[PDB]
């Protein structure tokens, strides 16, 4: 099944999201539904709040880049992955500057920077506990889909202008489809 | 002002705490609160939670182990500290057991094992951007406030027993006897 998607500037994207007491068949079957709707829109990563519910479960695929290091345990792309109640538990002091997009906020992309690496802890579909270890764009998207958790959308980083424009360009291109 | 201290099993612990978007005069205010709060009780550190404000927002003091290093420019104690929106930027691999109290958690002591060292970016009192770079004590107390902001207390990471042994001594010793 694939959900529909809360798009900024639905406020419901700026609340934090509470952790998974247990991984139960209710959480795989969101879990399930999640990933559907992430591979419908062509997307690397996927929030549970931005299809309306509060929970720390995040979904990732981000496949290996067409090819025209790592550090041993690390890895730079991969997938699919399920994440529930991430801990984040070693992170890079070197930063990268990449552009970025996100289903919440539709049509719009723009230069983030943040850590190269991070590892994190976690809980998998199984309720087993895991760490993936994160480079790359594997550790760009596992970042950006951890700020959803704490209610943080990527324009947060951006200048208010730049942000306001953004937000202003999603509603006009949804006032626009209304015409 | 001396405010009424949120104490487990109530459910308000459990939940996530929000970003603060202004730390405007109310802030401040709540701060003031919060420090005369653990002044008044005896406590090195205080989450807003714990005051029965879902923010992210903390208070420590830490006044002046050979299970630790002592790393050069990581501070020991210190304070107060009015530390908000806390962004941990750095996380030590080695991890140290010690013991911890809340007071949440009134009357009940136990040993838990957290990273040793800590950076932590947050706005302070009057909203400027700093930096933290915590050991020993003062690690062990930001981590401790950290968590309240995220929805736990200490006694997550203890057996059941445990748990709910300390939660049974609270309801117990908040009833004064009549003799
Ligand atoms: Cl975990
Ligand atoms: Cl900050
Ligand atoms: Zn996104
Ligand atoms: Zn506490």
Same mark, same amino acid.
């Given at each position: 099944?694939?959900?529909?998607?809360? !798009?900024?500037?639905?406020?419901?994207?700026?609340?934090?999201?509470?952790?998974?007491?247990?991984?139960?068949?209710?959480?795989?079957?969101?879990?399930?539904?999640? #990933?559907? !709707?992430?591979?419908?829109?062509?997307?690397?990563?996927?929030?549970?709040? +931005? %299809?309306?519910?509060?929970?720390?479960?995040? %979904?990732?695929?981000?496949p290996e880049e067409f090819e025209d290091?790592?550090?041993?345990?690390?890895?730079l792309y991969?997938?699919? *992955? =399920?994440?529930?109640?991430?801990?984040?538990?070693?992170?890079? +002091?070197?930063? %990268?500057?990449?552009?970025?997009?996100?289903?919440?906020?539709?049509? *719009? #992309?723009?230069?983030?920077?943040?850590?190269?690496?991070?590892?994190? +802890?976690?809980?998998? *579909?199984?309720?087993?506990? =895991?760490?993936?270890?994160?480079?790359g764009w594997?550790?760009? =998207?596992?970042?950006?889909?951890?700020?959803?958790?704490?209610? !943080?959308?990527?324009?947060? *980083?951006?200048?208010? #202008?730049?942000?306001?424009?953004?937000?202003?360009?999603?509603?006009?291109?949804?006032? !626009?489809?209304?015409?």
């Amino acid at each position: 099944s694939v959900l529909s998607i809360v !798009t900024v500037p639905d406020k419901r994207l700026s609340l934090c999201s509470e952790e998974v007491e247990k991984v139960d068949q209710s959480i795989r079957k969101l879990v399930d539904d999640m #990933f559907e !709707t992430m591979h419908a829109n062509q997307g690397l990563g996927l929030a549970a709040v +931005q %299809v309306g519910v509060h929970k720390r479960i995040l %979904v990732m695929n981000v496949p290996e880049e067409f090819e025209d290091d790592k550090i041993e345990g690390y890895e730079l792309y991969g997938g699919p *992955y =399920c994440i529930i109640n991430p801990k984040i538990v070693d992170i890079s +002091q070197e930063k %990268v500057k990449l552009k970025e997009g996100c289903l919440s906020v539709p049509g *719009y #992309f723009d230069y983030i920077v943040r850590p190269q690496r991070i590892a994190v +802890q976690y809980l998998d *579909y199984n309720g087993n506990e =895991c760490i993936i270890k994160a480079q790359g764009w594997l550790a760009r =998207c596992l970042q950006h889909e951890i700020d959803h958790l704490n209610g !943080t959308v990527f324009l947060k *980083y951006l200048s208010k #202008f730049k942000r306001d424009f953004a937000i202003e360009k999603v509603k006009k291109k949804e006032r !626009t489809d209304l015409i």
